[PDB]
Amino acid sequence: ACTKNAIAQTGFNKDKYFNGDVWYVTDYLNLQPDNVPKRYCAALAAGTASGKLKEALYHYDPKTQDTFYDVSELQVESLGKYTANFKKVDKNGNVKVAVTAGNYYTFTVMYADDSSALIHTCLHKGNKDLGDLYAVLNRNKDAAAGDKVKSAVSAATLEFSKFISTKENNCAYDNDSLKSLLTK
Ligand code: HEM
Ligand SMILES: [N]
């Protein structure tokens, strides 16, 4: 179930978030914890291409080896709040599963600055969803969450101590593939 209307950041700077670069997930929290694994690697690139907001996603489960990339076109609901389609692709952008009606995620940027962000997303696949997921992002894959993003976590009535870190997984990313997916 999707249960939260996530509040976008006051003064959100869209151009700085959607600048073409990679954001690494450093910490995450699902409100239905059994919906996601306890060990995981994820990253995204976010930018504008051909006049549209785009994200490219990467997921990797280091226990099962499941690996997948996605390309998304984001439509604007309001500043910092988006509805994204998705197509599953290989690292080279070859579509494995096309954009499909009712395959979408919502995406809200709750906080962002030059180095860090806090987002909310709820994923829909037909009549099922994967629950409310929060993620702390950083421009540096290893970086400890700083005071400002932690203040944003608390101001959303969340406890940072409940987030799961991706650090122990020593994740590695294909940054060229991921960023280049923005034009796919
Ligand atoms: C550590 C962070 C994350 C974890 C642990 C996580 C976990 C998952 C898992 C377990 C699935 C497969 C669900 C299923 O097959 O039912 C999935 C798929 C997906 N995730 Fe997440 N995810 C994370 C971050 C994100 C972020 C930030 C976004 C969007 C910006 C996102 C968007 C999606 C989409 C669109 C799919 C479906 C992919 C497809 O079928 O093509 N994920 N992720
Ligand atoms: N997700």
Side-chain angles (χ1 to χ4, degrees), residues 30 35-36 40 57 59 68 105 121-123 130-131 133:
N30 199 301
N35 279 2
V36 297
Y40 217 82
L57 314 180
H59 287 72
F68 51 99
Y105 61 94
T121 180
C122 198
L123 174 61
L130 283 293
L133 182 67

Side-chain angles (χ1 to χ4, degrees), residues 67-85:
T67 309
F68 51 99
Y69 292 84
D70 292 86
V71 173
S72 294
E73 304 168 278
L74 275 60
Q75 305 301 146
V76 179
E77 306 309 337
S78 56
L79 183 60
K81 292 190 60 87
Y82 309 97
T83 299
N85 69 201

Side-chain angles (χ1 to χ4, degrees), residues 2-4 7 10 14 17 28 30 49 62 66 86-88 93 105 114 129 135 139 142-143 156 160 162 168-169 184:
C2 307
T3 74
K4 298 280 200 182
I7 304 304
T10 298
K14 64 184 177 292
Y17 183 91
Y28 64 90
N30 199 301
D66 278 9
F86 59 92
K87 61 195 186 196
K88 188 177 288 189
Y105 61 94
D114 288 340
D129 68 71
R139 294 299 194 183
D142 302 303
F160 186 68
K162 294 190 73 180
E168 28 128 62
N169 309 125
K184 291 281 191 175

Side-chain angles (χ1 to χ4, degrees), residues 13 19 27 31 43 50 54 57 60-61 67 69 73 76 83 96 98 101 112-113 146-147 155-156 167 173:
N13 185 326
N19 71 344
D27 307 86
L31 298 187
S50 298
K54 300 289 283 294
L57 314 180
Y60 173 68
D61 187 315
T67 309
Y69 292 84
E73 304 168 278
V76 179
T83 299
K96 308 194 84 169
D113 63 24
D147 288 344
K167 178 175 19 74
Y173 308 90

Side-chain angles (χ1 to χ4, degrees), residues 102-131:
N103 271 10
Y104 71 95
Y105 61 94
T106 68
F107 192 87
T108 302
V109 185
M110 300 161 65
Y111 177 74
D113 63 24
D114 288 340
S115 66
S116 69
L118 176 63
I119 71 80
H120 168 272
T121 180
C122 198
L123 174 61
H124 297 261
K125 286 187 166 197
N127 279 325
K128 209 262 169 165
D129 68 71
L130 283 293

